[PDB]
Amino acid sequence: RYAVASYGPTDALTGQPLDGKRSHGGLRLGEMEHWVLTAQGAMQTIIEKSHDDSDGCISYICRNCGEPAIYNASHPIYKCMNCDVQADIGMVDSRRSSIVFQHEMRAANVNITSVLSPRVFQPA
Amino acid sequence: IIGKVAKIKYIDRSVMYGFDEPAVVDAVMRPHGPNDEIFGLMRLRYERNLNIGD
Amino acid sequence: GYANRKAIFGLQSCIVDYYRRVSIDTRLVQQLYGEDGLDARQLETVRFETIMLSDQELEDKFKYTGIQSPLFEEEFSRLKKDRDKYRQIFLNVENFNFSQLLTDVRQVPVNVASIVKNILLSSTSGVLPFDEKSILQKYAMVKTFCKNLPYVFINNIQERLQTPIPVYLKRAASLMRMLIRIELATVKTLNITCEQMSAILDLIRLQYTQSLINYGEAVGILAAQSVSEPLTQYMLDSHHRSVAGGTNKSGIVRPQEIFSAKPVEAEQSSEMLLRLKNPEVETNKTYAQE
Amino acid sequence: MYADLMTRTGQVTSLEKAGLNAREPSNVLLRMALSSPVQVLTDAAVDSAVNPIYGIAAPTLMGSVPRIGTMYSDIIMDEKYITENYKS
Amino acid sequence: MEAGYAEIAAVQFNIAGDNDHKRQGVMEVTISNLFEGTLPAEGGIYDARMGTTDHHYKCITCSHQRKQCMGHPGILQMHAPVLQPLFIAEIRRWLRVICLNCGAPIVDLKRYEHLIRPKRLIEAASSQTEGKQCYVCKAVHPKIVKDSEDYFTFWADQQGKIDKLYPQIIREIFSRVTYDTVVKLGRSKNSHPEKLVLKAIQIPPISIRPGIHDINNVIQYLVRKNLLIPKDLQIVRGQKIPLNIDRNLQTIQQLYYNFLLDSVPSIMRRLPRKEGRIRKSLLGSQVWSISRSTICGNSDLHLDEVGYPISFARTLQVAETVQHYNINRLMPYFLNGKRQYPGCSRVYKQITQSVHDIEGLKQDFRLEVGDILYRDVVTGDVAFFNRQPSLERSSIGVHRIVVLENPKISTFQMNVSACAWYNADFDGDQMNLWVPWSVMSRVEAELLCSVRNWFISTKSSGPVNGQVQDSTVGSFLLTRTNTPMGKNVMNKLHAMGLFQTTQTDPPCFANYSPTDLLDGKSVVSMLLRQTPINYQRAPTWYSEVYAPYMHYNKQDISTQIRNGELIEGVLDKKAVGAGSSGGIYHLISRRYGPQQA
Amino acid sequence: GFVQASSQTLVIIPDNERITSNVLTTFEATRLVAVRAQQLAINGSTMLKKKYSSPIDIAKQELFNRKIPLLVMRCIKVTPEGQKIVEIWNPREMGIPLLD
Amino acid sequence: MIDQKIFETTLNIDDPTNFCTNVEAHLLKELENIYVGKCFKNSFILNITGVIQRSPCFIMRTNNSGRGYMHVRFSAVVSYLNAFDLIAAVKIIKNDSNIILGESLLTEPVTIVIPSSESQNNVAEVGQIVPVQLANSSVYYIPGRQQASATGSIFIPKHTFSVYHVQEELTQEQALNLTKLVNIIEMLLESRSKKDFKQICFFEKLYYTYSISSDEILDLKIWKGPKGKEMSRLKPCNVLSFLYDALKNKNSSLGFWARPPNLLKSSPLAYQQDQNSFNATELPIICSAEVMFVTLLKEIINYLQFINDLCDTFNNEQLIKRHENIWMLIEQRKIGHDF
């Protein structure tokens, strides 16, 4: 038997709980669990478990160049080291292991550019 | 269950009993390893009757 | 697990859109989900009574002769056309299969027969007197209901406006149109008042709306789960199946031949069913054996 | 659902990585998740592949949630109702 | 300045050259030293401008702590140009198409116009180009042979004359290719071959390589041996080079190849398999607030209920936001704390924006509108119930929690008729359970994922649940016409005793003397009157196989129910069994709902 | 290049030309109730008459009594000329699925 | 300068129910609290004039917060600072050997850091208010900052000028476009005319390239120029009247235009000739009427704003004497009448 917590030891790389009862970490909602939850349409449960309980975080992407931006509400930093004067930063909901995945792709000399969903406005 | 401090003033490299069912300390010894260095050996016992789920 | 993961990654992008179509981000996979637009959890097996009947038993049971109006000649004529079209389609399906026999039993969203039975049970009235005005009226209500039936797939705004219906949505209401004309025939609704007809028609439309597939349902994941699950019992067998060359049906060899789209040269259990031309040769077994 | 997917392009495609590349070539993230990311990633960078975010695998690899089920439709605030019935 | 809400609509992939690395890099790695005392050395491979991995210091670049910093890449300027490990094959194609002396194309561009863009270069390179002569500079194109001793070195074979195409030579060969040649060969303007040679490589952010990992040794060796190569080195085609320089150049390039593609520690080795990045971290997740235990049978629980041990109920919590409409309900949870059940563990105070334990709670503390109370799990809460492998979409279902107050019970308990949803049994199966604490997930749990929604199979369009093994033979015995001791009847006291556990509203037995005898079909009818259905099928009991050798009672082989009245026949697998299409509970579902069934 | 996609204009189909159903899907009703329950957990300001001790019951009763201050937007198409054709539906005028 | 600019943004809304009770008022308040007084999209926002276009309040879809968001297209009063512009009110805060940091006062907040050379630290002192000249593209609008970071130089009036050879006519639509600059110059002149004569006289005496004595520099109503022995046989013309007459199409605009330092920079006068008889040290640039007219019009606006900022900086003469070191530095950089 095992029940842990809303908190505990996490992995330094992925930011996710450690594996199993031995590490005093969490339990895995694996690939097949997400298939079942998607088949049920339960997307708020996926956000609760895969994002709020595993490693969900905030990512900042500059609108004009699609590259990761640097934002900090306290100690105000609103900057982007690709245009540096036209920065238009939006916050997108992500996971740490996904940002690690994108940094690893760029480490292999593959440029990852995120095209944000465009603004939409009522007519006139 | 085992107190262990490393000197740099000290860093607490201790071992905590991380189990949801309590135990009783059954045997403690400090034997000498292959490199003639002391290590701590602890034996913990659990009184296990049959119960639901066994 | 190997077949489950490959089936899910190939199908998970299939999602129901606001037209009840299945598409991959824009690209149609189905014009209508399941070709009927229904959820698989909202189906009932129901028998269609006219399928097996002959031309005389059909005219004995369903042709109404109480009123000598040309409407009931047309009502029965639509029963034969539905009967003939059902036979033609599913006899053809019997042709291009090994052992897929025709049936007079379908899975439908609404059991029209049980709805009529329940209301007849709760009716204070018993046998109604012959009211020719109401018999003609109930016929018009049912005929209008079937004509407006495909609007279940659009909305009540277009039903009020009577805008044109897409052809593929007329076809999706064909089994329910067919069933309603059998179970709400004049010979079967003589003890039903016009107020009780409105209750029946309103109940059918409500239960038909409740059986439609939801917008944005991951129906490709649903299919992969439903088709991969029986493969476990398929694999639990295969010491009950042939393993010889030319008839290898062990493990998951035939499923892999289908899902990998393997060419005919890579098929280990291929078969074919040849039907004789001459009917006299057909009955004789020595003719078939030679 | 199997047959309509496997025949939507006019040819019978498989449930292997070859059929996925035939049906959804530009979905690099879905194709990376299936079989072999390094090979799929190498061709995507060389071909300058644009990957629109749809389905389940592409949003998941990007750290997002699929627009499916309860997230298929957008909810907006009813301004004309709140002003006439609520107060600050 | 706030960052507005946004979503990623598309992702585009490109080859990263040197301008990309110089723009995106936040610092330049110049020294091979690791640490200055306790803090990372400025300019080293652990420089804090690339991110933080300790709790002591922040990231210099974004001024965040370890949890909120996603890392920032750095730059390492190579003294000698290097080839990109991931696109070596691509480089080969470009060396087989264009002229090495002028950069003009050799093959006929318009010959390959009828091909599609992603295949023009491949097909033009597949053709024979050795021995041809350029139409501009009039040069003979040699054979571009690939060295078999490594994955990156290329030789030029001009009729037996041997040259080694060093990365700088390849760079100068590629820099003469015009954009028109690139476009006519199918590639985009972003895929110019000049990008295929790196003079400045990207040092990945420290968030990728915590533990300041054997990948840091590869980077350290790469930086340390890069300094050996003279900064003013130049290579010309046909030039002789020393042995120490050649050993240094090959080892630097081998290290960079093994930094990215070693056995494909390397960057790309993290991706592929089931234990890799994509499948273990992205498509799955380790989560918090989840429990696992062996499952056990319990016939007193409803089908949509799960028995939950009290010890687990005081570990998993539900988040309650304090408002005016629930301040009175949540107060008893708050008072109990961790000293009595049902209590609470933590409170989130919206004033100071922090979480406080309930045993470290101040004297003047009180719940305020906007606080979040984390209370214990109580009976009636919803929980997701999961058995692996999750093969159907009923493999995860939402049950109502019944908390087991007995402290000596560690099992998840459920009704045996609920096992059909999970393909479970009680030989030692373990199941997962997590309780939704979020309001949005709690609404979704009870409106979408409740197990009444999977009473009818999605796969087969039939009922999943029913009687299994004890209420199947038990229903037969109850509705059987004759017992070995005469008619199958029971007195008023024993008929009343059948309903004393059903947890429904008891029927009325007032019109019964104590000596009155009730048969089993009358008692069953007293329960089916609430959901009157119609049923008429032969039971499983009647088999033509058994008919010659046993005498069937004619009242047992014809099961008929009329408006909830069991007129005759026995109830067994055909009528009441799990998975029985057209059965009693399939008919009750079709008329009264799957929760009524 | 121009990474930033151009802004879109929201084209609302007139109410008499809507093609989607007037009945809420179970997904849409669940989303409406979840969103409204979270809003009530933020504010608590409701026009519901009866008292309920949890945000979820207030949200369900508001949906059932046709008092929910939300609108459903069904995105029909994104035109490559910049238009975003959608349909706006009022859940207070819609059919409500079997949420039991 | 000041201008009208249109910005697009996305606002987060923590309380959508309360926010939607008064959408326009709440949107204005949030936009003013977020964007007023900062640098954003290569500009500096002063006031939020209005909201041209907005979206409905969408509910956030990728988290369980229940929070809303809205796309807003609004109009703002911005202040873009061009190259070689003239700021005439800056307070030196720091004077070190490395760099000299001052902050502008009369203009919208600009911090000017002069790269300190070996001839500056011995002159400038803390508390002194001096005019500065800007440089090319060095007005970096770092997003989220309260001011503009820009390099600057102590504005010693030059002795050079440029010659534009106009080969095209300034048609009606371009004249209507430049009518806004005409009106801006008219407003600047009417703001100049409200003062006491002495301060304009003294600041123009300081910042005129040459030395002119005993009240011969300014006729406010007619602008007849300085009456020094008729240096040129042609009277300098009016740019304003020339544009007003090109509106009615009575004049041609071809030929060689120049404004040598002998002219008053703030006055609408300029030199137009049918032959390249200008005594400049650079090659005349061939261009159309639009380029030349924009250049000279904006130069007139810049110098009128410069003189008005000098006027509004100092009203008493005690501060004039307290900064007299800069006065002597500018005075020595003049030329006598040895011509």
Ligand SMILES: [Mg+2]
């Ligand atoms: Mg088992």
Ligand SMILES: [Zn+2]
């Ligand atoms: Zn940017």
Ligand SMILES: [Zn+2]
């Ligand atoms: Zn950082």
